[PDB]
Design a protein around this ligand. Sequence first.
Ligand SMILES: [Mg+2]
Lengths: 158, 211, 183, 113, 59
Amino acid sequence: MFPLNFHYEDVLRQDLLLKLNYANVMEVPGLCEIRVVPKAPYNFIIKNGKLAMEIPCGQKFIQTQDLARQSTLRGHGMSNFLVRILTVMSLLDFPVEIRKNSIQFSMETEFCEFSPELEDHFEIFEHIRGFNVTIITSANTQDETLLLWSGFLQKDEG
Amino acid sequence: SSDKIVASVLFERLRVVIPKPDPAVYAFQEFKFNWQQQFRRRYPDEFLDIAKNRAKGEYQMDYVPAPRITEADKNNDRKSLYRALDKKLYLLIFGKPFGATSDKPVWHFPEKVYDSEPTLRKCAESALKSVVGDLTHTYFVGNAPMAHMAIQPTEEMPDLPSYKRFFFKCSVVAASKYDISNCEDFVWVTKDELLEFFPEQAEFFNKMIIS
Amino acid sequence: RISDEKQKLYEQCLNAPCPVRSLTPKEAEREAQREKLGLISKDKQRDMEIQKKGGAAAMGINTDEPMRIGTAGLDYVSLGIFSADELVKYKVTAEDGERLAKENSKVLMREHRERRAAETVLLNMKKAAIEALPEKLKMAALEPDLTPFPANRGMATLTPPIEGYLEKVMDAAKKSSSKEKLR
Amino acid sequence: VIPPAVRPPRLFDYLKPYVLKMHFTNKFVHAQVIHSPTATVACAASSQEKALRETMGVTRDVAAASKIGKILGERLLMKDIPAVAIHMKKEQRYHGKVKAVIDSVREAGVKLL
Amino acid sequence: MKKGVHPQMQWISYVTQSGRLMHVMMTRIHHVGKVYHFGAKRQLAQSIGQIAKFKRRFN
RNA sequence: AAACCGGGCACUACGGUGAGACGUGAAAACACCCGAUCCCAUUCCGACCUCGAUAUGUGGAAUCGUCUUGCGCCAUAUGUACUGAGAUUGUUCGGGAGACAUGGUCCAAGCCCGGUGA
Ligand SMILES: [Mg+2]
């Protein structure tokens, strides 16, 4: 029903079976979770820092002992967040970094400047350094992660 | 001795649109959203009045979406990459294959007999080149064949030599039109239409093509 | 600078109420004991303030008229994915919820099993195809493909592309990027 | 940490030899009453049985576990065991299927020690 | 998901550069859902070299 | 019916606990693969647990096997240290490590439920 996971199951799984050496269909990498953590120097006190995290994630964060804030996204909320960030990715050339099994992205204020739904209420996200977004994949190899991200990052330009 | 293996190519167009979901799945998704709305925080109207104060009338341009049913679908126009949007399309040409049962033309996939290449990969890109002219709007997947078919003589036909046919897979990238040559005719057909055109290889192609 | 009235608005948003106040039964008994003693918590005070000006229906919750997926005029029936006769009718209750959840579980389980079985047959056939090759031709075809996916291949969605849209956007972008901007 | 091995509860004054142990799988439910001195199965009731796996539709859920508990309680009362002592494994709490089995046995009429 | 703890949601529509429609969820900050169109606002910036600057003047 | 296989309990370091390689899902069993509507889980999250669903897919994680092995554990030296009694200023009679060295990872095994055999 939904475009992102439907596209994964219908296109990328067959091609990732065919491109690499796999002994089983359960050895194909997938998509586990998205972890969002704000950038280090911030206020802990203002309501802007809490609201600018609650709005793009869609769920309440956790604030541990006040020195750490975190949100973890799994399932259809993770899919909605990913299909938003991949659509807004097509308006610029934001850098990402591929680790051994995960993708690191830097959620700056210049991202929410280009987000069309966050053009309004922009004074929430003003005076915020940004966030760090982690995309965890069930990948054995950094090249599997790179192939999976290159599959997921699609546009109609070029 | 046993030689003259052929490389064939499966040329595909993927789905443009999402197929129709199951009504039970759609009903549960709608119900789940409406039921979970009851237990969630409701933002104040003064907070939504920031966007209500940004209510304006531009040069209004209304968005009308393209229909999922195409004129090619309703006119049964083959050789078109605009019909059958929610299914996949496959390229079939018309001419003489390597099989020499007769001189008459028959539907088949593009192919080439291997002579001196390092890879059947490299054989298959040349086989597709000889059909569509050029290799700019295509994407070949895998260095390994997705399926094979070994043809041996039988009691009705002892003349053709034993040979293998290896299928590789290629996908349309962005083009909606191609210049198809080295054939009499061509078509863009689905999995079910491919099975209707091929009564004798239906068992093999049902497992080879995933619906 | 940063308006304290604006921060007073944002704290209201962060402490925004809910249409129905759900209580765990270990907390409902604490609430009943508090009501016996005569103590009113602030959240219960806000709830009774809600219920003396309305309730769940006053914040756009209805059990008889579910809110459809998508915006106005662009639902699945309006796009034509579904007809109006093949939609399952329900209400926002638990009794419809159990039946819808069980049917969804059965349908999704069967679809997942069919996809996995098809992929398994394809993988077994590919493994059989690699072993009927000559030696050097086999060592060539055991090499993994690590070329990245094309960025120009599309992604499936609810609507086919408009024919006179993409080239129009490209023409507007190049008309804007024409000439040089003054410094 | 290394998890130390589990011991049976300590003997204080009386023996209490009948121990109720429960087990749940993806398809069936099982419950056993073990005689501690002989290390034998005094009584058993499971939805895998030949006389039980066709007389009920669903063999895996809370209702099935409650039916199994009722059957086991009546079997204990006709085999003359008036009381049993419940043993709970490493992940079982008084919730769901465990709760259904225990409450069904207690309503059948076995005292719990 | 706990109850009484998360923000409410809303449905909004995205239109890609090719006119493709897509439905997503979003935290409810508007009265009604809207449709947002995406353009080609890539905004790629280039600077001329010194030999290019020299040839722009002295030729 | 008497054997074999699967699950639960019971026995146990020669029966423990890690690592590597090769296999196995019997018409059955176990687990995973799917979902989060009610119960439950999360100081955010179906990650863990829980509750539902699976005419047949997979043994990728766990679970079962076979061997190689590392720590342990068991058995046994030879010799020395040390030591009880006794003064030829300990010339006698007893006990006997640690660390080395050598081998093994046995044998036997009960109750219930299900399947194949029948
Ligand atoms: Mg010794």
